[PDB]
Amino acid sequence: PGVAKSQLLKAICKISPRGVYTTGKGSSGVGLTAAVMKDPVTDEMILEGGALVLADNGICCIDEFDKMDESDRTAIH
DNA sequence: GCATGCATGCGCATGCATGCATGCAGCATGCATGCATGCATGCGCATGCATGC
Ligand SMILES: Nc1ncnc2c1ncn2[C@@H]1O[C@H](COP(=O)(O)OP(=O)(O)O)[C@@H](O)[C@H]1O
Numbered sequence: 551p552g553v554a555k556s557q558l559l560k561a562i563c564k565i566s567p568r569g570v571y572t573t574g575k576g577s578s579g580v581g582l583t584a585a586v587m588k589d590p591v592t593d594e595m596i597l598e599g600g601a602l603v604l605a606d607n608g609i610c611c612i613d614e615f616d617k618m619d620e621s622d623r624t625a626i627h
Numbered sequence: 628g629c630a631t632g633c634a635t636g637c638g639c640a641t642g643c644a645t646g647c648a649t650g651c652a653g654c655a656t657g658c659a660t661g662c663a664t665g666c667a668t669g670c671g672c673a674t675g676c677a678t679g680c
């Protein structure tokens with residue numbers, strides 16, 4: 551504890567053009583991969599992207615890696 | 628003086644601008660049904676955790 555790892559993650563997420571900062575249990579399930587929603591404007595079925603889909607061609611920053619679910623860890627794998 | 632003919636008022640029918648109610652119909656408004664739509668309910672099922680042994 552207290553060696554400034556999280557500050558480094560915050561900094562590296564501020565320097566990258568595309569980069570997302572997420573914490574262990576606050577981003578679980580469809581908040582990582584994708585979700586099914588209906589588009590209000592075009593009346594079509596879309597897929598909403600999660601953190602991993604927002605950081606495509608970028609850097610993803612995950613904090614408290616040890617606390618995540620097994621399902622979330624499979625996706626990272 | 629006397630005989631005559633025209634203008635003026637009296638008497639009689641008729642038409643006609645106002646005005647208003649009633650029965651019938653034409654006419655538009657409000658109502659009943661019927662349905663499309665998207666949201667929220669509540670309900671069993673699978674997963675991840677906290678507890679006991
Ligand atoms: N080497 C360091 N240099 C500067 N600040 C540090 C250093 N180590 C820790 N800190 C400070 O101490 C705190 C550590 O918080 P954090 O980044 O969450 O540490 P950790 O990731 O280990 O939990 C922050 O305020 C950070 O600025």
Ligand SMILES: [Mg+2]
Pocket residue numbers: 555556
């Ligand atoms: Mg930390």
